[PDB]
Coordinates of C-alpha atoms and ligand atoms in Angstrom, one line a residue:
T1 CA -10.0 -19.2 -13.7
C2 CA -6.7 -17.2 -13.3
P3 CA -6.3 -14.3 -15.7
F4 CA -3.1 -14.1 -17.9
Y5 CA -1.7 -11.1 -16.2
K6 CA -1.2 -13.1 -13.0
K7 CA 1.0 -15.7 -14.8
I8 CA 4.7 -15.6 -15.3
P9 CA 5.6 -17.2 -18.8
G10 CA 8.3 -19.8 -18.9
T11 CA 7.9 -20.5 -15.3
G12 CA 5.6 -22.4 -13.0
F13 CA 4.8 -19.2 -11.1
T14 CA 1.7 -17.1 -10.3
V15 CA 1.5 -13.7 -8.5
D16 CA -1.4 -12.7 -6.2
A17 CA -3.5 -15.7 -7.4
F18 CA -5.0 -17.5 -4.5
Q19 CA -8.8 -17.1 -5.3
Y20 CA -8.8 -19.5 -8.4
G21 CA -8.4 -22.8 -6.6
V22 CA -5.5 -25.0 -7.7
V23 CA -3.9 -23.3 -10.8
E24 CA -2.8 -25.9 -13.4
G25 CA 0.9 -26.0 -13.6
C26 CA 1.7 -23.6 -10.7
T27 CA 4.6 -24.9 -8.6
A28 CA 5.0 -21.7 -6.5
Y29 CA 2.5 -19.0 -5.5
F30 CA 4.0 -15.5 -5.0
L31 CA 2.2 -12.9 -2.7
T32 CA 3.4 -9.3 -3.1
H33 CA 1.7 -7.9 0.0
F34 CA -0.9 -8.4 2.7
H35 CA -4.0 -6.6 1.3
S36 CA -7.2 -8.6 0.9
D37 CA -7.8 -8.2 -2.9
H38 CA -4.3 -9.8 -3.3
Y39 CA -4.4 -12.6 -0.6
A40 CA -8.1 -13.4 -1.3
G41 CA -8.3 -17.1 -1.0
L42 CA -5.5 -18.0 1.5
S43 CA -6.3 -19.7 4.8
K44 CA -5.0 -22.4 7.2
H45 CA -6.0 -25.2 4.7
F46 CA -3.7 -23.9 1.9
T47 CA -1.0 -26.6 1.1
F48 CA 1.2 -25.1 -1.8
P49 CA 4.4 -23.2 -1.2
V50 CA 3.9 -19.4 -0.8
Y51 CA 6.8 -17.0 -1.4
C52 CA 6.8 -13.5 0.2
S53 CA 8.6 -11.0 2.4
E54 CA 9.4 -11.8 6.1
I55 CA 6.7 -9.3 7.1
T56 CA 4.0 -10.7 4.8
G57 CA 5.0 -14.2 6.2
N58 CA 4.4 -13.1 9.8
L59 CA 0.9 -11.9 8.9
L60 CA 0.1 -15.1 7.0
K61 CA 1.1 -17.2 10.1
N62 CA -0.5 -15.1 12.7
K63 CA -3.6 -13.5 11.1
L64 CA -4.7 -16.1 8.4
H65 CA -3.2 -19.1 10.3
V66 CA -1.3 -20.5 7.3
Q67 CA 1.0 -23.3 8.4
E68 CA 4.6 -22.6 8.8
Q69 CA 5.8 -25.3 6.4
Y70 CA 4.1 -23.6 3.4
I71 CA 5.5 -20.1 4.2
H72 CA 8.7 -19.3 2.4
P73 CA 10.1 -15.9 3.4
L74 CA 12.8 -14.2 1.4
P75 CA 15.2 -11.4 2.3
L76 CA 15.1 -8.1 0.2
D77 CA 17.8 -7.1 -2.2
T78 CA 19.1 -10.6 -2.4
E79 CA 19.5 -13.0 -5.4
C80 CA 17.6 -16.2 -4.6
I81 CA 16.8 -19.4 -6.5
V82 CA 13.2 -20.6 -6.5
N83 CA 12.3 -23.8 -8.4
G84 CA 15.4 -23.4 -10.6
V85 CA 14.7 -19.7 -11.3
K86 CA 16.6 -16.6 -10.1
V87 CA 14.4 -14.0 -8.3
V88 CA 15.0 -10.8 -6.3
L89 CA 12.4 -9.0 -4.0
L90 CA 12.6 -5.2 -3.9
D91 CA 10.8 -2.8 -1.6
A92 CA 7.6 -1.5 -3.3
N93 CA 7.2 1.6 -1.1
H94 CA 3.5 0.6 -0.5
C95 CA 2.4 -0.9 2.9
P96 CA 4.7 -2.8 5.3
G97 CA 6.1 -6.0 3.7
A98 CA 5.1 -5.0 0.2
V99 CA 7.5 -6.0 -2.6
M100 CA 8.2 -5.9 -6.3
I101 CA 9.6 -9.1 -7.8
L102 CA 12.4 -9.6 -10.6
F103 CA 12.3 -12.8 -12.4
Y104 CA 15.3 -13.9 -14.5
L105 CA 13.8 -16.4 -17.0
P106 CA 16.0 -19.3 -18.1
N107 CA 15.9 -18.0 -21.7
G108 CA 17.3 -14.5 -20.8
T109 CA 14.1 -12.6 -20.6
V110 CA 13.9 -10.3 -17.5
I111 CA 10.5 -9.5 -15.9
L112 CA 9.6 -6.9 -13.2
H113 CA 6.2 -7.3 -11.4
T114 CA 5.6 -4.1 -9.3
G115 CA 2.9 -5.5 -7.1
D116 CA 1.2 -2.5 -5.7
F117 CA 3.8 0.4 -5.5
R118 CA 4.5 4.1 -5.2
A119 CA 7.3 4.7 -7.6
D120 CA 10.2 6.8 -6.3
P121 CA 13.5 8.1 -7.7
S122 CA 15.3 5.9 -5.2
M123 CA 14.2 2.8 -7.1
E124 CA 16.5 4.0 -10.0
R125 CA 19.5 3.0 -7.7
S126 CA 18.2 -0.3 -6.5
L127 CA 19.3 -3.6 -8.2
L128 CA 17.1 -2.5 -11.1
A129 CA 19.8 -0.2 -12.4
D130 CA 22.1 -3.1 -13.3
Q131 CA 20.3 -4.7 -16.3
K132 CA 17.6 -4.5 -18.8
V133 CA 14.0 -5.4 -18.2
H134 CA 11.9 -6.7 -21.1
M135 CA 8.4 -6.9 -19.6
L136 CA 6.8 -4.9 -16.8
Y137 CA 3.6 -5.9 -15.0
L138 CA 2.7 -2.4 -13.8
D139 CA 0.4 -1.1 -11.0
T140 CA -1.7 1.4 -13.0
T141 CA -4.1 2.4 -10.3
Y142 CA -3.7 6.1 -11.0
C143 CA -2.6 6.1 -14.7
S144 CA -4.3 9.3 -15.8
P145 CA -3.0 12.9 -15.5
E146 CA -5.9 14.1 -13.3
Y147 CA -4.4 12.1 -10.5
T148 CA -2.2 14.5 -8.6
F149 CA -1.5 14.5 -4.8
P150 CA 1.2 15.8 -2.5
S151 CA 4.2 14.0 -1.1
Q152 CA 3.7 11.8 1.9
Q153 CA 6.0 14.2 3.8
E154 CA 3.8 17.3 3.1
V155 CA 0.6 15.4 4.1
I156 CA 2.2 14.2 7.4
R157 CA 3.4 17.8 8.1
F158 CA -0.2 19.0 7.6
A159 CA -1.6 16.3 10.0
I160 CA 1.0 16.9 12.8
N161 CA 0.5 20.7 12.8
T162 CA -3.3 20.3 12.7
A163 CA -3.4 17.8 15.6
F164 CA -0.8 19.7 17.7
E165 CA -2.6 23.0 17.3
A166 CA -6.0 21.6 18.2
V167 CA -4.9 19.7 21.3
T168 CA -2.7 22.7 22.6
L169 CA -5.8 24.9 22.4
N170 CA -8.0 22.3 24.0
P171 CA -6.2 19.7 26.2
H172 CA -9.5 17.8 26.4
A173 CA -9.7 17.1 22.7
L174 CA -9.3 13.4 21.5
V175 CA -7.7 12.6 18.1
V176 CA -9.1 9.7 16.2
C177 CA -7.7 8.1 13.0
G178 CA -9.4 5.6 10.7
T179 CA -7.9 2.3 9.3
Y180 CA -9.1 -0.8 7.4
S181 CA -5.9 -2.6 6.4
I182 CA -2.2 -2.4 6.9
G183 CA -0.6 0.8 5.4
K184 CA -0.4 4.5 6.2
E185 CA 0.7 3.8 9.8
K186 CA 2.9 6.9 9.6
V187 CA -0.3 9.0 9.9
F188 CA -1.2 8.0 13.4
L189 CA 2.4 7.4 14.6
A190 CA 3.5 10.9 13.7
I191 CA 0.5 12.4 15.4
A192 CA 0.9 10.4 18.6
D193 CA 4.6 11.2 18.7
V194 CA 4.0 15.1 18.5
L195 CA 1.3 14.7 21.3
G196 CA 3.5 12.5 23.6
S197 CA 1.0 9.7 23.6
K198 CA 0.7 6.1 22.6
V199 CA -1.7 5.0 20.0
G200 CA -4.7 3.1 21.4
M201 CA -6.5 0.4 19.5
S202 CA -8.4 -2.9 19.5
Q203 CA -6.6 -6.2 20.3
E204 CA -7.0 -7.4 16.7
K205 CA -5.3 -4.3 15.3
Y206 CA -2.6 -4.4 18.0
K207 CA -1.9 -7.9 16.9
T208 CA -1.6 -6.9 13.2
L209 CA 0.8 -4.1 14.1
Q210 CA 2.9 -6.5 16.2
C211 CA 3.6 -8.5 13.0
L212 CA 5.3 -5.6 11.1
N213 CA 9.0 -5.4 12.5
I214 CA 8.5 -1.7 13.2
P215 CA 11.4 -0.4 15.5
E216 CA 10.6 0.3 19.1
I217 CA 6.8 -0.4 18.5
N218 CA 6.2 -1.5 22.1
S219 CA 7.0 2.2 22.9
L220 CA 4.3 3.5 20.4
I221 CA 1.1 1.4 20.6
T222 CA -1.2 0.0 23.3
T223 CA -4.5 -1.7 24.0
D224 CA -5.2 0.5 27.0
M225 CA -7.6 3.1 25.4
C226 CA -7.9 5.0 28.7
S227 CA -4.2 6.1 28.8
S228 CA -4.1 7.2 25.1
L229 CA -5.3 10.5 23.4
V230 CA -4.8 9.1 19.9
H231 CA -7.4 6.3 19.1
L232 CA -7.6 4.1 16.1
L233 CA -11.0 3.0 14.8
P234 CA -12.4 1.2 11.8
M235 CA -12.7 3.5 8.8
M236 CA -16.4 2.9 8.7
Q237 CA -16.9 4.4 12.1
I238 CA -15.2 7.7 10.9
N239 CA -18.4 9.7 10.6
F240 CA -20.5 12.1 12.8
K241 CA -22.7 9.2 14.3
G242 CA -19.8 6.8 14.8
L243 CA -17.7 9.5 16.5
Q244 CA -20.4 10.8 18.8
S245 CA -21.0 7.3 20.0
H246 CA -17.2 6.7 20.6
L247 CA -17.1 10.0 22.5
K248 CA -19.9 8.7 24.9
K249 CA -17.6 5.7 25.7
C250 CA -14.7 7.8 26.9
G251 CA -16.4 8.7 30.2
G252 CA -16.3 12.5 30.0
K253 CA -12.5 12.4 29.6
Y254 CA -13.0 14.4 26.4
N255 CA -15.3 17.1 25.0
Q256 CA -14.1 17.4 21.3
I257 CA -13.0 15.0 18.6
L258 CA -10.6 15.7 15.8
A259 CA -10.7 12.8 13.3
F260 CA -8.6 11.9 10.2
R261 CA -9.6 9.8 7.2
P262 CA -6.6 8.9 5.0
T263 CA -8.1 8.3 1.6
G264 CA -6.1 7.9 -1.6
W265 CA -7.1 10.4 -4.3
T266 CA -10.3 12.4 -4.2
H267 CA -11.5 15.2 -6.8
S268 CA -10.9 18.1 -4.2
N269 CA -7.2 17.4 -5.3
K270 CA -8.0 19.1 -8.7
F271 CA -8.8 22.5 -7.0
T272 CA -7.4 22.6 -3.4
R273 CA -3.8 22.6 -2.1
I274 CA -3.0 20.5 1.0
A275 CA -2.3 23.8 2.9
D276 CA -6.0 24.8 2.2
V277 CA -7.8 21.6 3.3
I278 CA -10.6 22.2 5.7
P279 CA -12.6 19.7 7.7
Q280 CA -16.3 18.8 7.8
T281 CA -17.6 19.9 11.2
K282 CA -20.8 19.1 13.3
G283 CA -20.8 20.6 16.8
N284 CA -17.7 19.4 18.7
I285 CA -16.7 16.9 16.0
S286 CA -14.4 17.7 13.0
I287 CA -13.3 15.3 10.2
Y288 CA -10.4 15.7 7.8
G289 CA -10.0 13.8 4.6
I290 CA -6.3 13.7 3.8
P291 CA -4.8 12.5 0.5
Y292 CA -2.2 10.1 1.8
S293 CA -1.4 7.7 -1.1
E294 CA 0.6 4.5 -1.1
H295 CA 0.3 4.3 -5.0
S296 CA 2.2 6.2 -7.7
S297 CA 0.8 9.5 -8.9
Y298 CA 0.5 9.8 -12.7
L299 CA 3.9 11.8 -12.9
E300 CA 5.7 9.4 -10.5
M301 CA 4.5 6.4 -12.7
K302 CA 5.5 8.1 -15.9
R303 CA 9.0 8.9 -14.6
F304 CA 9.7 5.4 -13.4
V305 CA 8.6 3.8 -16.7
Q306 CA 10.5 6.3 -18.9
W307 CA 13.6 5.5 -16.8
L308 CA 13.0 1.7 -16.9
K309 CA 12.4 1.6 -20.7
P310 CA 10.5 -1.7 -20.8
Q311 CA 9.8 -3.4 -24.2
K312 CA 6.3 -4.5 -23.2
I313 CA 3.9 -3.2 -20.4
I314 CA 1.1 -5.4 -18.9
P315 CA -1.3 -3.4 -16.6
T316 CA -2.5 -5.1 -13.5
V317 CA -5.2 -2.5 -12.4
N318 CA -8.1 -1.0 -14.2
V319 CA -8.1 -3.9 -16.7
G320 CA -11.8 -4.6 -16.8
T321 CA -13.1 -1.8 -19.2
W322 CA -12.2 -1.2 -22.9
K323 CA -12.1 2.6 -22.2
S324 CA -9.5 2.1 -19.3
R325 CA -7.4 -0.2 -21.4
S326 CA -7.5 2.2 -24.4
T327 CA -6.6 5.2 -22.1
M328 CA -3.6 3.3 -20.6
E329 CA -2.2 2.1 -24.0
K330 CA -2.3 5.8 -25.3
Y331 CA -0.2 7.0 -22.3
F332 CA 2.3 4.2 -22.7
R333 CA 2.8 5.1 -26.4
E334 CA 3.1 8.9 -25.5
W335 CA 5.8 8.0 -22.9
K336 CA 7.7 5.9 -25.4
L337 CA 7.6 8.5 -28.2
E338 CA 8.7 11.3 -25.9
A339 CA 11.6 9.3 -24.4
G340 CA 12.6 7.5 -27.6
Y341 CA 12.8 3.8 -26.5
Ligands
NI401 NI1 -2.5 -2.8 -2.0

């Protein structure tokens, strides 16, 4: 049974609610982005209308084989009428195709659902700026002050410099990058670009990347592993055993691997600066954990909400424990008292 925080009151609409069978009274299913916890339940046999971004729509058609007649893509930043209700999709600064949704209820209530997002000051000059929002359904993944991490730019600067240094010292080093979903493609694209290489990967992963409307992508990726010195592998293979084994397969083309694991937050963020990150090393294999986040830090979240001044906040993440729920409610009250809404 669908939880309340996936339902939009005064509408026939649900958000990210495909794993509960037929939801009673749902005339339109919204999908914010193509991550498995959110799409869980969709397949080629799904027969209700789905509303989503153009990029999410390409992934549904090609990867899950949802039939075209049930896929309803909408443009960003554009007022649209769905089942007699005005909606806008806004960029969520998460993974490709991820959106926030504005719902203009027939009784005058305005509702923002962030999906998953990384709040940014640029959102303060989207179509959000033009009217009041009464309720906010908020991605609260990292809603606690211990969650700090650098900007995406700083992390990408660290990665490029690390990779370029290593491969200039040893032209026979291979760079490997882990992945398990869409997102964070800048990591491996930036590295391949500084090295003058294409990124090599499986056919399944090539196919996924072909769905994402990325400019000049045919210039950046390939299924020919032999011609590439940046390889993508499943995240589970990013460990000493997995990498040794992969190095065997390259035919003595390479004698060293440098591997990256983009995580989100990890506790070494409470002590160490990005500049000071060091890898774990076993022989000719080195492995870096890098804190590349596609979710808000605590401070980015707080700033967005204090700018938005919502009347009510409904968390969509960490909702399962009384301790999490009590923690979150305390921060929302702090923010309110400090900003005076
Ligand atoms: Ni996500």
